[PDB]
């Protein structure tokens, strides 16, 4: 969607494997501001929104 | 009211210990007050500060 009408999808009750997402070099910008890209697979999350 | 001095000393020591043990909940500019919560989310370089 547009930047002023961005859609937010609720991600809950599922297994999140961020290692596969980080190993993919197809992403040009990947910057974390509160966590690390390597510690995502060893940490739970309450509510995830994209 | 006769043993006020000993009770006052004991209360001062207890309050000092309570303040020293409660200062662990502060952040001092960090993201959390528990070192395990910081070492389990950040890396070596970024958590160092």
PDB file of N, CA and C in Angstrom:
ATOM      1  N   UNK A   1       0.830  -1.192   0.000  1.00  0.00           N
ATOM      2  CA  UNK A   1       0.000   0.000   0.000  1.00  0.00           C
ATOM      3  C   UNK A   1       0.873   1.254   0.000  1.00  0.00           C
ATOM      4  N   UNK A   2       0.222   2.413  -0.007  1.00  0.00           N
ATOM      5  CA  UNK A   2       0.936   3.679  -0.014  1.00  0.00           C
ATOM      6  C   UNK A   2       1.595   3.929   1.342  1.00  0.00           C
ATOM      7  N   UNK A   3       2.516   4.896   1.359  1.00  0.00           N
ATOM      8  CA  UNK A   3       3.250   5.189   2.586  1.00  0.00           C
ATOM      9  C   UNK A   3       2.358   5.902   3.596  1.00  0.00           C
ATOM     10  N   UNK A   4       1.368   6.662   3.128  1.00  0.00           N
ATOM     11  CA  UNK A   4       0.438   7.319   4.037  1.00  0.00           C
ATOM     12  C   UNK A   4      -0.716   6.417   4.448  1.00  0.00           C
ATOM     13  N   UNK A   5      -0.924   5.305   3.750  1.00  0.00           N
ATOM     14  CA  UNK A   5      -1.965   4.332   4.067  1.00  0.00           C
ATOM     15  C   UNK A   5      -1.355   2.946   4.216  1.00  0.00           C
ATOM     16  N   UNK A   6      -0.251   2.871   4.955  1.00  0.00           N
ATOM     17  CA  UNK A   6       0.457   1.611   5.135  1.00  0.00           C
ATOM     18  C   UNK A   6      -0.398   0.612   5.904  1.00  0.00           C
ATOM     19  N   UNK A   7      -0.345  -0.645   5.475  1.00  0.00           N
ATOM     20  CA  UNK A   7      -1.090  -1.724   6.107  1.00  0.00           C
ATOM     21  C   UNK A   7      -0.205  -2.449   7.111  1.00  0.00           C
ATOM     22  N   UNK A   8      -0.768  -2.738   8.281  1.00  0.00           N
ATOM     23  CA  UNK A   8      -0.066  -3.437   9.350  1.00  0.00           C
ATOM     24  C   UNK A   8      -0.700  -4.807   9.542  1.00  0.00           C
ATOM     25  N   UNK A   9       0.104  -5.856   9.399  1.00  0.00           N
ATOM     26  CA  UNK A   9      -0.357  -7.227   9.566  1.00  0.00           C
ATOM     27  C   UNK A   9       0.094  -7.755  10.921  1.00  0.00           C
ATOM     28  N   UNK A  10      -0.841  -8.337  11.667  1.00  0.00           N
ATOM     29  CA  UNK A  10      -0.542  -8.874  12.988  1.00  0.00           C
ATOM     30  C   UNK A  10       0.048 -10.272  12.850  1.00  0.00           C
ATOM     31  N   UNK A  11       1.248 -10.463  13.387  1.00  0.00           N
ATOM     32  CA  UNK A  11       1.938 -11.747  13.362  1.00  0.00           C
ATOM     33  C   UNK A  11       1.944 -12.287  14.785  1.00  0.00           C
ATOM     34  N   UNK A  12       1.213 -13.376  15.013  1.00  0.00           N
ATOM     35  CA  UNK A  12       1.106 -13.951  16.345  1.00  0.00           C
ATOM     36  C   UNK A  12       0.816 -15.441  16.235  1.00  0.00           C
ATOM     37  N   UNK A  13       1.197 -16.175  17.281  1.00  0.00           N
ATOM     38  CA  UNK A  13       0.960 -17.615  17.389  1.00  0.00           C
ATOM     39  C   UNK A  13       1.578 -18.364  16.206  1.00  0.00           C
ATOM     40  N   UNK A  14       2.900 -18.258  16.100  1.00  0.00           N
ATOM     41  CA  UNK A  14       3.641 -18.911  15.030  1.00  0.00           C
ATOM     42  C   UNK A  14       5.119 -18.908  15.387  1.00  0.00           C
ATOM     43  N   UNK A  15       5.869 -19.776  14.716  1.00  0.00           N
ATOM     44  CA  UNK A  15       7.312 -19.872  14.904  1.00  0.00           C
ATOM     45  C   UNK A  15       7.987 -18.930  13.915  1.00  0.00           C
ATOM     46  N   UNK A  16       8.790 -18.006  14.431  1.00  0.00           N
ATOM     47  CA  UNK A  16       9.487 -17.020  13.615  1.00  0.00           C
ATOM     48  C   UNK A  16      10.965 -17.379  13.555  1.00  0.00           C
ATOM     49  N   UNK A  17      11.450 -17.684  12.357  1.00  0.00           N
ATOM     50  CA  UNK A  17      12.849 -18.037  12.126  1.00  0.00           C
ATOM     51  C   UNK A  17      13.493 -16.886  11.356  1.00  0.00           C
ATOM     52  N   UNK A  18      14.060 -15.934  12.096  1.00  0.00           N
ATOM     53  CA  UNK A  18      14.709 -14.781  11.486  1.00  0.00           C
ATOM     54  C   UNK A  18      16.066 -15.112  10.880  1.00  0.00           C
ATOM     55  N   UNK A  19      16.613 -16.297  11.157  1.00  0.00           N
ATOM     56  CA  UNK A  19      17.901 -16.667  10.578  1.00  0.00           C
ATOM     57  C   UNK A  19      17.806 -16.807   9.064  1.00  0.00           C
ATOM     58  N   UNK A  20      16.719 -17.406   8.570  1.00  0.00           N
ATOM     59  CA  UNK A  20      16.536 -17.540   7.129  1.00  0.00           C
ATOM     60  C   UNK A  20      16.368 -16.171   6.483  1.00  0.00           C
ATOM     61  N   UNK A  21      15.683 -15.254   7.167  1.00  0.00           N
ATOM     62  CA  UNK A  21      15.508 -13.910   6.628  1.00  0.00           C
ATOM     63  C   UNK A  21      16.817 -13.132   6.619  1.00  0.00           C
ATOM     64  N   UNK A  22      17.674 -13.345   7.619  1.00  0.00           N
ATOM     65  CA  UNK A  22      18.940 -12.626   7.672  1.00  0.00           C
ATOM     66  C   UNK A  22      19.971 -13.202   6.710  1.00  0.00           C
ATOM     67  N   UNK A  23      19.950 -14.518   6.483  1.00  0.00           N
ATOM     68  CA  UNK A  23      20.902 -15.126   5.562  1.00  0.00           C
ATOM     69  C   UNK A  23      20.642 -14.733   4.114  1.00  0.00           C
ATOM     70  N   UNK A  24      19.427 -14.296   3.792  1.00  0.00           N
ATOM     71  CA  UNK A  24      19.114 -13.868   2.434  1.00  0.00           C
ATOM     72  C   UNK A  24      19.760 -12.516   2.156  1.00  0.00           C
ATOM     73  N   UNK A  25      20.683 -12.485   1.197  1.00  0.00           N
ATOM     74  CA  UNK A  25      21.383 -11.259   0.840  1.00  0.00           C
ATOM     75  C   UNK A  25      20.579 -10.362  -0.092  1.00  0.00           C
ATOM     76  N   UNK A  26      19.337 -10.729  -0.411  1.00  0.00           N
ATOM     77  CA  UNK A  26      18.520  -9.931  -1.317  1.00  0.00           C
ATOM     78  C   UNK A  26      18.059  -8.617  -0.703  1.00  0.00           C
ATOM     79  N   UNK A  27      18.273  -8.413   0.594  1.00  0.00           N
ATOM     80  CA  UNK A  27      17.868  -7.185   1.262  1.00  0.00           C
ATOM     81  C   UNK A  27      19.024  -6.192   1.257  1.00  0.00           C
ATOM     82  N   UNK A  28      18.724  -4.941   0.910  1.00  0.00           N
ATOM     83  CA  UNK A  28      19.752  -3.914   0.808  1.00  0.00           C
ATOM     84  C   UNK A  28      19.904  -3.099   2.084  1.00  0.00           C
ATOM     85  N   UNK A  29      18.853  -3.002   2.896  1.00  0.00           N
ATOM     86  CA  UNK A  29      18.889  -2.246   4.142  1.00  0.00           C
ATOM     87  C   UNK A  29      18.331  -3.116   5.256  1.00  0.00           C
ATOM     88  N   UNK A  30      19.163  -3.402   6.258  1.00  0.00           N
ATOM     89  CA  UNK A  30      18.770  -4.220   7.409  1.00  0.00           C
ATOM     90  C   UNK A  30      19.493  -3.652   8.629  1.00  0.00           C
ATOM     91  N   UNK A  31      18.808  -2.777   9.361  1.00  0.00           N
ATOM     92  CA  UNK A  31      19.376  -2.112  10.528  1.00  0.00           C
ATOM     93  C   UNK A  31      18.426  -2.279  11.703  1.00  0.00           C
ATOM     94  N   UNK A  32      18.922  -2.871  12.783  1.00  0.00           N
ATOM     95  CA  UNK A  32      18.155  -3.045  14.007  1.00  0.00           C
ATOM     96  C   UNK A  32      18.564  -1.982  15.018  1.00  0.00           C
ATOM     97  N   UNK A  33      17.576  -1.430  15.723  1.00  0.00           N
ATOM     98  CA  UNK A  33      17.814  -0.337  16.653  1.00  0.00           C
ATOM     99  C   UNK A  33      17.627  -0.719  18.114  1.00  0.00           C
ATOM    100  N   UNK A  34      17.029  -1.872  18.401  1.00  0.00           N
ATOM    101  CA  UNK A  34      16.837  -2.290  19.776  1.00  0.00           C
ATOM    102  C   UNK A  34      17.337  -3.690  20.056  1.00  0.00           C
ATOM    103  N   UNK A  35      17.600  -4.455  19.000  1.00  0.00           N
ATOM    104  CA  UNK A  35      18.054  -5.830  19.100  1.00  0.00           C
ATOM    105  C   UNK A  35      19.208  -6.037  18.124  1.00  0.00           C
ATOM    106  N   UNK A  36      19.682  -7.279  18.048  1.00  0.00           N
ATOM    107  CA  UNK A  36      20.750  -7.656  17.140  1.00  0.00           C
ATOM    108  C   UNK A  36      20.240  -8.637  16.091  1.00  0.00           C
ATOM    109  N   UNK A  37      20.805  -8.613  14.879  1.00  0.00           N
ATOM    110  CA  UNK A  37      20.354  -9.550  13.839  1.00  0.00           C
ATOM    111  C   UNK A  37      20.712 -11.001  14.120  1.00  0.00           C
ATOM    112  N   UNK A  38      21.588 -11.271  15.087  1.00  0.00           N
ATOM    113  CA  UNK A  38      21.984 -12.636  15.404  1.00  0.00           C
ATOM    114  C   UNK A  38      21.275 -13.203  16.625  1.00  0.00           C
ATOM    115  N   UNK A  39      20.701 -12.354  17.474  1.00  0.00           N
ATOM    116  CA  UNK A  39      20.019 -12.793  18.683  1.00  0.00           C
ATOM    117  C   UNK A  39      18.510 -12.902  18.503  1.00  0.00           C
ATOM    118  N   UNK A  40      18.017 -12.818  17.265  1.00  0.00           N
ATOM    119  CA  UNK A  40      16.578 -12.895  17.042  1.00  0.00           C
ATOM    120  C   UNK A  40      16.058 -14.320  17.182  1.00  0.00           C
ATOM    121  N   UNK A  41      16.892 -15.317  16.890  1.00  0.00           N
ATOM    122  CA  UNK A  41      16.462 -16.707  16.953  1.00  0.00           C
ATOM    123  C   UNK A  41      16.461 -17.269  18.368  1.00  0.00           C
ATOM    124  N   UNK A  42      16.998 -16.539  19.340  1.00  0.00           N
ATOM    125  CA  UNK A  42      17.062 -16.984  20.726  1.00  0.00           C
ATOM    126  C   UNK A  42      16.304 -16.029  21.640  1.00  0.00           C
ATOM    127  N   UNK A  43      15.155 -15.540  21.177  1.00  0.00           N
ATOM    128  CA  UNK A  43      14.371 -14.586  21.950  1.00  0.00           C
ATOM    129  C   UNK A  43      12.922 -14.648  21.495  1.00  0.00           C
ATOM    130  N   UNK A  44      12.002 -14.705  22.455  1.00  0.00           N
ATOM    131  CA  UNK A  44      10.583 -14.684  22.149  1.00  0.00           C
ATOM    132  C   UNK A  44      10.107 -13.249  21.932  1.00  0.00           C
ATOM    133  N   UNK A  45       8.868 -13.123  21.462  1.00  0.00           N
ATOM    134  CA  UNK A  45       8.265 -11.823  21.207  1.00  0.00           C
ATOM    135  C   UNK A  45       6.789 -11.874  21.563  1.00  0.00           C
ATOM    136  N   UNK A  46       6.301 -10.803  22.191  1.00  0.00           N
ATOM    137  CA  UNK A  46       4.903 -10.757  22.606  1.00  0.00           C
ATOM    138  C   UNK A  46       3.984 -10.531  21.412  1.00  0.00           C
ATOM    139  N   UNK A  47       4.148  -9.402  20.727  1.00  0.00           N
ATOM    140  CA  UNK A  47       3.347  -9.079  19.554  1.00  0.00           C
ATOM    141  C   UNK A  47       4.251  -8.483  18.489  1.00  0.00           C
ATOM    142  N   UNK A  48       4.183  -9.033  17.279  1.00  0.00           N
ATOM    143  CA  UNK A  48       5.006  -8.596  16.158  1.00  0.00           C
ATOM    144  C   UNK A  48       4.096  -7.966  15.114  1.00  0.00           C
ATOM    145  N   UNK A  49       4.486  -6.793  14.622  1.00  0.00           N
ATOM    146  CA  UNK A  49       3.733  -6.079  13.602  1.00  0.00           C
ATOM    147  C   UNK A  49       4.686  -5.577  12.528  1.00  0.00           C
ATOM    148  N   UNK A  50       4.266  -5.703  11.272  1.00  0.00           N
ATOM    149  CA  UNK A  50       5.069  -5.304  10.124  1.00  0.00           C
ATOM    150  C   UNK A  50       4.362  -4.183   9.379  1.00  0.00           C
TER     151      UNK A  50
ATOM    152  N   UNK B   1      10.040   4.122  74.020  1.00  0.00           N
ATOM    153  CA  UNK B   1      10.810   5.318  73.703  1.00  0.00           C
ATOM    154  C   UNK B   1      12.165   5.360  74.398  1.00  0.00           C
ATOM    155  N   UNK B   2      12.541   4.308  75.124  1.00  0.00           N
ATOM    156  CA  UNK B   2      13.823   4.278  75.816  1.00  0.00           C
ATOM    157  C   UNK B   2      14.952   3.744  74.946  1.00  0.00           C
ATOM    158  N   UNK B   3      14.655   2.811  74.043  1.00  0.00           N
ATOM    159  CA  UNK B   3      15.654   2.203  73.166  1.00  0.00           C
ATOM    160  C   UNK B   3      15.639   2.824  71.777  1.00  0.00           C
ATOM    161  N   UNK B   4      15.398   4.133  71.694  1.00  0.00           N
ATOM    162  CA  UNK B   4      15.300   4.781  70.399  1.00  0.00           C
ATOM    163  C   UNK B   4      16.607   4.825  69.634  1.00  0.00           C
ATOM    164  N   UNK B   5      17.738   4.844  70.341  1.00  0.00           N
ATOM    165  CA  UNK B   5      19.029   4.984  69.671  1.00  0.00           C
ATOM    166  C   UNK B   5      19.408   3.710  68.924  1.00  0.00           C
ATOM    167  N   UNK B   6      19.299   2.557  69.590  1.00  0.00           N
ATOM    168  CA  UNK B   6      19.616   1.293  68.935  1.00  0.00           C
ATOM    169  C   UNK B   6      18.673   1.029  67.768  1.00  0.00           C
ATOM    170  N   UNK B   7      17.378   1.282  67.966  1.00  0.00           N
ATOM    171  CA  UNK B   7      16.414   1.099  66.889  1.00  0.00           C
ATOM    172  C   UNK B   7      16.699   2.045  65.731  1.00  0.00           C
ATOM    173  N   UNK B   8      17.124   3.274  66.035  1.00  0.00           N
ATOM    174  CA  UNK B   8      17.460   4.224  64.979  1.00  0.00           C
ATOM    175  C   UNK B   8      18.669   3.753  64.182  1.00  0.00           C
ATOM    176  N   UNK B   9      19.692   3.237  64.865  1.00  0.00           N
ATOM    177  CA  UNK B   9      20.867   2.724  64.164  1.00  0.00           C
ATOM    178  C   UNK B   9      20.488   1.544  63.277  1.00  0.00           C
ATOM    179  N   UNK B  10      19.677   0.624  63.806  1.00  0.00           N
ATOM    180  CA  UNK B  10      19.261  -0.539  63.026  1.00  0.00           C
ATOM    181  C   UNK B  10      18.449  -0.105  61.811  1.00  0.00           C
ATOM    182  N   UNK B  11      17.554   0.869  61.992  1.00  0.00           N
ATOM    183  CA  UNK B  11      16.738   1.341  60.878  1.00  0.00           C
ATOM    184  C   UNK B  11      17.588   2.046  59.829  1.00  0.00           C
ATOM    185  N   UNK B  12      18.602   2.801  60.259  1.00  0.00           N
ATOM    186  CA  UNK B  12      19.486   3.453  59.299  1.00  0.00           C
ATOM    187  C   UNK B  12      20.264   2.428  58.486  1.00  0.00           C
ATOM    188  N   UNK B  13      20.804   1.401  59.150  1.00  0.00           N
ATOM    189  CA  UNK B  13      21.513   0.352  58.420  1.00  0.00           C
ATOM    190  C   UNK B  13      20.583  -0.374  57.453  1.00  0.00           C
ATOM    191  N   UNK B  14      19.360  -0.678  57.896  1.00  0.00           N
ATOM    192  CA  UNK B  14      18.413  -1.378  57.036  1.00  0.00           C
ATOM    193  C   UNK B  14      18.026  -0.529  55.832  1.00  0.00           C
ATOM    194  N   UNK B  15      17.827   0.775  56.037  1.00  0.00           N
ATOM    195  CA  UNK B  15      17.457   1.647  54.928  1.00  0.00           C
ATOM    196  C   UNK B  15      18.616   1.820  53.955  1.00  0.00           C
ATOM    197  N   UNK B  16      19.849   1.867  54.468  1.00  0.00           N
ATOM    198  CA  UNK B  16      21.006   1.915  53.581  1.00  0.00           C
ATOM    199  C   UNK B  16      21.099   0.652  52.734  1.00  0.00           C
ATOM    200  N   UNK B  17      20.908  -0.514  53.356  1.00  0.00           N
ATOM    201  CA  UNK B  17      20.926  -1.764  52.599  1.00  0.00           C
ATOM    202  C   UNK B  17      19.801  -1.803  51.570  1.00  0.00           C
ATOM    203  N   UNK B  18      18.617  -1.308  51.937  1.00  0.00           N
ATOM    204  CA  UNK B  18      17.492  -1.306  51.007  1.00  0.00           C
ATOM    205  C   UNK B  18      17.757  -0.388  49.820  1.00  0.00           C
ATOM    206  N   UNK B  19      18.343   0.784  50.064  1.00  0.00           N
ATOM    207  CA  UNK B  19      18.685   1.672  48.959  1.00  0.00           C
ATOM    208  C   UNK B  19      19.750   1.050  48.064  1.00  0.00           C
ATOM    209  N   UNK B  20      20.751   0.401  48.664  1.00  0.00           N
ATOM    210  CA  UNK B  20      21.801  -0.227  47.868  1.00  0.00           C
ATOM    211  C   UNK B  20      21.248  -1.369  47.023  1.00  0.00           C
ATOM    212  N   UNK B  21      20.276  -2.114  47.552  1.00  0.00           N
ATOM    213  CA  UNK B  21      19.711  -3.226  46.793  1.00  0.00           C
ATOM    214  C   UNK B  21      18.652  -2.762  45.801  1.00  0.00           C
ATOM    215  N   UNK B  22      18.071  -1.579  46.001  1.00  0.00           N
ATOM    216  CA  UNK B  22      17.095  -1.043  45.064  1.00  0.00           C
ATOM    217  C   UNK B  22      17.736  -0.238  43.944  1.00  0.00           C
ATOM    218  N   UNK B  23      18.972   0.233  44.133  1.00  0.00           N
ATOM    219  CA  UNK B  23      19.679   0.914  43.054  1.00  0.00           C
ATOM    220  C   UNK B  23      19.940   0.014  41.854  1.00  0.00           C
ATOM    221  N   UNK B  24      19.759  -1.303  41.991  1.00  0.00           N
ATOM    222  CA  UNK B  24      19.953  -2.203  40.862  1.00  0.00           C
ATOM    223  C   UNK B  24      18.839  -2.092  39.830  1.00  0.00           C
ATOM    224  N   UNK B  25      17.710  -1.483  40.187  1.00  0.00           N
ATOM    225  CA  UNK B  25      16.600  -1.324  39.257  1.00  0.00           C
ATOM    226  C   UNK B  25      16.768  -0.129  38.329  1.00  0.00           C
ATOM    227  N   UNK B  26      17.770   0.714  38.562  1.00  0.00           N
ATOM    228  CA  UNK B  26      17.986   1.880  37.721  1.00  0.00           C
ATOM    229  C   UNK B  26      18.590   1.470  36.381  1.00  0.00           C
ATOM    230  N   UNK B  27      18.507   2.384  35.417  1.00  0.00           N
ATOM    231  CA  UNK B  27      19.009   2.151  34.068  1.00  0.00           C
ATOM    232  C   UNK B  27      20.280   2.918  33.752  1.00  0.00           C
ATOM    233  N   UNK B  28      20.424   4.135  34.279  1.00  0.00           N
ATOM    234  CA  UNK B  28      21.592   4.983  34.033  1.00  0.00           C
ATOM    235  C   UNK B  28      21.834   5.202  32.541  1.00  0.00           C
ATOM    236  N   UNK B  29      20.763   5.235  31.752  1.00  0.00           N
ATOM    237  CA  UNK B  29      20.867   5.431  30.323  1.00  0.00           C
ATOM    238  C   UNK B  29      20.848   4.168  29.492  1.00  0.00           C
ATOM    239  N   UNK B  30      20.814   2.996  30.120  1.00  0.00           N
ATOM    240  CA  UNK B  30      20.773   1.745  29.383  1.00  0.00           C
ATOM    241  C   UNK B  30      19.338   1.399  28.995  1.00  0.00           C
ATOM    242  N   UNK B  31      19.196   0.326  28.216  1.00  0.00           N
ATOM    243  CA  UNK B  31      17.872  -0.092  27.769  1.00  0.00           C
ATOM    244  C   UNK B  31      17.154  -0.940  28.809  1.00  0.00           C
ATOM    245  N   UNK B  32      17.875  -1.488  29.782  1.00  0.00           N
ATOM    246  CA  UNK B  32      17.264  -2.315  30.813  1.00  0.00           C
ATOM    247  C   UNK B  32      18.150  -2.284  32.050  1.00  0.00           C
ATOM    248  N   UNK B  33      17.596  -2.769  33.160  1.00  0.00           N
ATOM    249  CA  UNK B  33      18.315  -2.834  34.424  1.00  0.00           C
ATOM    250  C   UNK B  33      18.900  -4.211  34.708  1.00  0.00           C
ATOM    251  N   UNK B  34      18.592  -5.209  33.884  1.00  0.00           N
ATOM    252  CA  UNK B  34      19.102  -6.566  34.048  1.00  0.00           C
ATOM    253  C   UNK B  34      20.148  -6.814  32.973  1.00  0.00           C
ATOM    254  N   UNK B  35      21.334  -7.260  33.393  1.00  0.00           N
ATOM    255  CA  UNK B  35      22.405  -7.518  32.437  1.00  0.00           C
ATOM    256  C   UNK B  35      22.091  -8.712  31.547  1.00  0.00           C
ATOM    257  N   UNK B  36      21.335  -9.685  32.058  1.00  0.00           N
ATOM    258  CA  UNK B  36      20.954 -10.827  31.237  1.00  0.00           C
ATOM    259  C   UNK B  36      20.016 -10.417  30.110  1.00  0.00           C
ATOM    260  N   UNK B  37      19.137  -9.445  30.358  1.00  0.00           N
ATOM    261  CA  UNK B  37      18.247  -8.961  29.311  1.00  0.00           C
ATOM    262  C   UNK B  37      18.987  -8.153  28.254  1.00  0.00           C
ATOM    263  N   UNK B  38      20.144  -7.587  28.594  1.00  0.00           N
ATOM    264  CA  UNK B  38      20.924  -6.843  27.611  1.00  0.00           C
ATOM    265  C   UNK B  38      21.821  -7.781  26.815  1.00  0.00           C
ATOM    266  N   UNK B  39      22.465  -8.735  27.489  1.00  0.00           N
ATOM    267  CA  UNK B  39      23.339  -9.680  26.806  1.00  0.00           C
ATOM    268  C   UNK B  39      22.576 -10.681  25.950  1.00  0.00           C
ATOM    269  N   UNK B  40      21.273 -10.845  26.169  1.00  0.00           N
ATOM    270  CA  UNK B  40      20.479 -11.773  25.376  1.00  0.00           C
ATOM    271  C   UNK B  40      19.843 -11.123  24.157  1.00  0.00           C
ATOM    272  N   UNK B  41      19.981  -9.809  23.998  1.00  0.00           N
ATOM    273  CA  UNK B  41      19.415  -9.093  22.862  1.00  0.00           C
ATOM    274  C   UNK B  41      20.454  -8.385  22.010  1.00  0.00           C
ATOM    275  N   UNK B  42      21.483  -7.806  22.621  1.00  0.00           N
ATOM    276  CA  UNK B  42      22.494  -7.071  21.882  1.00  0.00           C
ATOM    277  C   UNK B  42      23.743  -7.930  21.680  1.00  0.00           C
ATOM    278  N   UNK B  43      24.662  -7.430  20.854  1.00  0.00           N
ATOM    279  CA  UNK B  43      25.923  -8.113  20.595  1.00  0.00           C
ATOM    280  C   UNK B  43      26.988  -7.657  21.581  1.00  0.00           C
ATOM    281  N   UNK B  44      28.247  -8.008  21.320  1.00  0.00           N
ATOM    282  CA  UNK B  44      29.356  -7.652  22.200  1.00  0.00           C
ATOM    283  C   UNK B  44      29.719  -6.177  22.057  1.00  0.00           C
ATOM    284  N   UNK B  45      29.758  -5.651  20.831  1.00  0.00           N
ATOM    285  CA  UNK B  45      30.228  -4.283  20.628  1.00  0.00           C
ATOM    286  C   UNK B  45      29.190  -3.276  21.108  1.00  0.00           C
ATOM    287  N   UNK B  46      27.921  -3.492  20.757  1.00  0.00           N
ATOM    288  CA  UNK B  46      26.896  -2.496  21.059  1.00  0.00           C
ATOM    289  C   UNK B  46      26.504  -2.506  22.532  1.00  0.00           C
ATOM    290  N   UNK B  47      26.497  -3.677  23.170  1.00  0.00           N
ATOM    291  CA  UNK B  47      26.092  -3.752  24.570  1.00  0.00           C
ATOM    292  C   UNK B  47      27.209  -3.280  25.493  1.00  0.00           C
ATOM    293  N   UNK B  48      28.428  -3.173  24.966  1.00  0.00           N
ATOM    294  CA  UNK B  48      29.588  -2.782  25.758  1.00  0.00           C
ATOM    295  C   UNK B  48      29.383  -1.419  26.409  1.00  0.00           C
ATOM    296  N   UNK B  49      28.741  -0.494  25.693  1.00  0.00           N
ATOM    297  CA  UNK B  49      28.508   0.842  26.242  1.00  0.00           C
ATOM    298  C   UNK B  49      27.410   0.797  27.298  1.00  0.00           C
TER     299      UNK B  49
END
